[PDB]
Ligand binder design. Structure first.
Ligand SMILES: C[C@H](CCC(=O)NCCC[N+](C)(C)C[C@H](O)CS(=O)(=O)O)[C@H]1CC[C@H]2[C@@H]3[C@H](O)C[C@@H]4C[C@H](O)CC[C@]4(C)[C@H]3C[C@H](O)[C@]12C
Ligand SMILES: [Zn+2]
Ligand SMILES: [Zn+2]
Lengths: 48, 215, 49, 83, 146, 48, 49, 110, 50
RNA sequence: GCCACAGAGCA
DNA sequence: TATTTTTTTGCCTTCCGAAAATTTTG
DNA sequence: CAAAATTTTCGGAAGGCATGCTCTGTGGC
């Protein structure tokens, strides 16, 4: 979960702002890259 | 003369642009359309009839924004002034200090032209509840926060600082330090004990947050 | 499962003397650095060190 | 008062290499001083290999006290840690 | 008299226009006036860099100095093809620039970074450090490795 | 630090010189039995 | 002749970097319990793994 | 000034004297050279190297304009070659170079 | 390049072997004067170290 | 035995 | 006793008059 | 306002420092 600097939850409309960068962004980037790789394989299968 | 007049006009116009961006970045209310003031409007509004820089007219005052005063309840209006004197004398600097003290401004920005004398430099601690910051026009030609090397610095409030100290379970002397009189710290107007959050972009991982404390 | 297992074992283990590892990983390549004279992008008069 | 309860443990559940080395050294030192063993040793005489066999099927009576920088610690059973 | 400077920056030895592979032209100079170059008309001040790191620290700040350290060390390693992981370089850059300024890995730098007495005494200037510790009566906690 | 009795400036001026133990400045035996070479600290102490 | 400079540089780097370690809260700290990095390399990943 | 006394071939130095007028006096022997009404000068001709015309060749096959040259008292040429160049920041106007086709004297307007 | 038979298997080697006399020098550095082992032994009078 | 000096080995 | 050579190079900070610059008196 | 005290700057001199381990032989008190 993404928390702001104050210590409360962050709204969905501003999740990607610079001021809300946490220490868990590396894990989120890894999960996004893994999902993108799996989606690329599925896209190749769908295209063929 | 083109070299004596037009170059100085463009130089001081870029300095005004940088000062506007600085005051906007501190949380004060400057509208967006005011920052992109073109050189023609600058000549038509702030210059003389026959083409001279009128540095006395271009001094102004800025008030804090509603979100800024929500985050920082102690923030007050500032007064920014441009000194017409080439070298700063004690009399002009004492006049600036007297004006700041009399008008009850929380802080003041003093933009000098060439050099500042040591005796006039001793008067920035003179006001006890207000802080006077000095800047050079040659240092304000281009904005350092727009440089590709300088990452994003965001000043944290007291509540956010306490939340950070509670999260990492540390005392304020254990954080990495950032000096005052650092150019970015001068840009943000950091005080002692203020915590700045730095958004670093590394090609290895991406965006990650570091923290520094002003000393 | 393989990707997640590799990710969890790639984290820095607590207690690691990572400063000494970095110091050695910087100092050791200096031994194999033989002499070479470099130039700054097609200019044969600059000779950056 | 510095002991974090078992429910709110935040450190990693995996055994680091340093924890493995320290546990093996401690158990070998204990066996070298005539401590009882909990494995069916097949003619082994070196304490280190007996300690390795003990760690192989998690039959070692020690816990790791991981000290956070603030001062609070964290007790992890060796059989609970994943190796 | 004929050795005075009537135009140009006082610390710039020379300047060369370099035409890169893309065809765009960059003005690369030898000198120490980063601020005056990036303030000069016709030069984009948001993209002007220097290999010198204390110059970048004086002009732009401490984080720019850290990036300059990392980029310069990485470039030096990559020119020889030594293939050093950049995280070690980041650790070195953070260690150099976590006290608010660029210290440097020297006797003078360690004399400011480290408050331990026996670690500094075992490196260089043993007697001076020991006598300064005795005079200033500083307490040395046994927490470091040395 | 003046809270301890040893924290005075006059402590940093030589009035009493602590003569070191001979276990840290031992007399080195030579190949000749009657004569034993002495450390430089002992000779300097005698000179003092 | 390069061995002298390499050895002195390695000695300096290790005397400056020996005290650092990765604590159990994934923050790189010095021996005096002061943070150099909040997360190692921005992501907390071992170059060895 | 590098001049030597004819009597002893020693260095001549310029002295103000009591009268306030400079004289080429020799401090070794009684010799003076008055310079009232005579201008003595030593010229150090600095070396001049060839420089390429950085604006040269840019006025060929370009459009013309009807702008009077600044030297109106000497000539009245109106047609002049002109072109544009960006040597400043992108937020300030592009500068304009003009060359008169009769008298030369190339000038940049703004 | 000669054709050699291996002494272990007896078969012909599948490559011609470069075979002939070369002058060799025996250097003074022999392992009999380099091998050393201590365990416990003499100690210095000052530092009480080996 | 102490102290310097000199040469030699491995990148 | 008083003739009389060097035998690495580069970098660094602290100290300290000297001089330049600025402030301060009369 | 110009003398006069004060502060800052700018040079030149003075110390400090420069890979690791290992093996012999010779000389002098
Ligand atoms: C050696 C050189 C003069 C040569 C004659 C002087 C004159 C200009 C000086 C630099 C500038 O001041 C900018 C900067 C200020 C920082 O504070 C310290 C570093 C920087 C890089 C300086 C270093 C040095 O001091 C320079 C190059
Ligand atoms: Zn003469
Ligand atoms: Zn004309």
């Amino acid at each position: 979960v993404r928390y702001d600097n104050s210590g409360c939850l962050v709204k969905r409309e501003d999740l990607n702002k610079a001021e809300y960068v946490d220490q868990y962004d590396a894990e989120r980037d890894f999960y996004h890259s893994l999902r993108e790789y799996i989606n690329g394989k599925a896209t190749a299968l769908a295209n063929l | 003369m083109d070299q004596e007049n037009e170059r100085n006009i463009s130089r001081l116009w870029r300095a005004f642009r940088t000062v506007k961006e600085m005051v906007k970045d501190r949380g004060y209310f400057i509208t967006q359309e005011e920052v992109e003031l073109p050189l023609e409007d600058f000549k038509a509004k702030y210059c003389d009839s026959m083409g001279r820089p009128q540095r006395k007219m271009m001094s102004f005052q800025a008030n804090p924004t509603e979100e800024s005063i929500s985050k920082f309840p102690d923030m007050g209006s500032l007064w920014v002034e441009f000194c017409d004197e080439p070298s700063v004398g004690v009399k002009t600097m004492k006049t600036f200090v007297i004006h700041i003290q009399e008008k009850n401004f929380q802080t003041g920005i003093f933009v000098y032209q060439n050099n500042i004398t040591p005796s006039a430099m001793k008067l920035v601690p003179s006001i006890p509840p207000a802080t006077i910051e000095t800047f050079n026009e040659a240092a304000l030609v281009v904005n350092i926060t727009h440089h590709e090397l300088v990452p994003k610095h965001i000043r944290l409030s007291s509540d956010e600082k306490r939340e950070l100290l509670k999260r990492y379970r540390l005392k304020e002397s254990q954080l990495p330090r950032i000096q005052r009189a650092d150019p970015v710290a001068l840009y943000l107007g950091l005080k002692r004990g203020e915590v700045v959050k730095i958004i670093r972009k590394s090609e290895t991982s991406g965006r990650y947050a570091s923290y520094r404390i002003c000393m | 499962e393989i990707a997640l297992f590799k990710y969890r074992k790639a984290r820095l283990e607590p207690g690691t003397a990572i400063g000494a590892i970095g110091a050695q990983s910087i100092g050791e390549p200096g031994t194999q650095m033989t002499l070479k004279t470099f130039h700054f992008a097609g200019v044969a008069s600059m000779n950056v060190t | 008062e510095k002991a974090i309860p078992k429910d709110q443990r935040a450190t990693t559940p995996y055994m680091t290499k340093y924890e493995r080395a320290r546990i093996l050294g401690t158990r070998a030192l204990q066996i070298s001083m005539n401590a009882p063993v909990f494995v069916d040793l097949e003619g082994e005489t070196d304490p280190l290999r007996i300690a390795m066999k003990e760690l192989a099927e998690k039959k070692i009576p020690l816990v790791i006290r991981r000290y956070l920088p603030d001062g609070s610690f964290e007790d992890w059973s060796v059989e609970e840690l994943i190796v | 008299l004929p050795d005075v400077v009537v135009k140009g920056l006082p610390d710039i030895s020379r300047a060369v226009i370099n035409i890169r592979d893309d065809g765009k032209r960059e003005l690369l100079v030898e000198g120490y006036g980063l601020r005056d170059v990036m303030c000069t008309d016709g030069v984009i001040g948001s993209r002007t860099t220097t290999n010198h790191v204390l110059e970048v620290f004086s002009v732009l700040g401490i984080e720019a100095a850290r990036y300059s350290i990392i980029r310069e060390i990485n470039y030096t390693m990559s020119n020889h093809g030594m293939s050093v992981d950049p995280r070690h370089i980041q650790l070195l850059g953070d260690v150099m620039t976590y006290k608010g300024e660029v210290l440097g890995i020297t006797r003078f730098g360690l004399s400011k970074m480290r408050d331990s007495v026996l670690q500094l005494a075992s490196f260089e200037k043993t007697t001076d450090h020991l006598f300064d510790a005795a005079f200033y009566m500083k307490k040395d906690a046994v927490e470091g490795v040395s | 630090d003046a809270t301890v009795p040893s924290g005075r400036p006059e402590t940093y001026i030589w009035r009493y010189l602590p003569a070191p133990p001979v276990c840290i400045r031992p007399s080195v035996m030579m190949q000749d039995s009657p004569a034993s070479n002495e450390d430089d600290l002992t000779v300097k102490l005698t000179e003092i | 002749v390069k061995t002298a400079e390499t050895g002195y540089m390695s000695r300096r780097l290790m005397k400056s970097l020996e005290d650092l370690s990765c604590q159990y809260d994934n923050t790189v700290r010095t021996s005096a319990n002061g943070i150099v990095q909040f997360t190692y390399g921005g992501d907390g990943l071992d170059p060895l793994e | 000034m590098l001049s030597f006394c004819p009597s002893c071939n020693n260095m001549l130095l310029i002295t103000s004297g009591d009268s306030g007028v400079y004289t080429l006096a020799c401090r070794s022997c009684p010799y003076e050279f008055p310079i009232e009404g005579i201008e003595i000068y030593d010229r150090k001709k600095l070396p001049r190297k060839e420089v390429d015309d950085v604006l040269g060749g840019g006025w060929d096959n370009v459009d013309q304009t009807k702008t009077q040259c600044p030297n109106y008292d000497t000539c009245g040429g109106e047609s002049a070659y002109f072109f544009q160049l960006q040597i400043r920041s992108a937020d300030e106007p592009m500068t304009t170079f003009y060359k008169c086709v009769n008298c030369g004297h190339r000038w940049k307007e703004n | 390049k000669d054709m050699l038979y291996s002494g272990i298997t007896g078969e012909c080697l599948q490559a011609y072997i470069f075979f002939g006399p070369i002058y060799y020098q025996k250097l003074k550095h022999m392992v009999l004067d380099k091998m050393h082992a201590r365990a416990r032994g003499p100690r210095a009078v000052l530092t009480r170290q080996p």
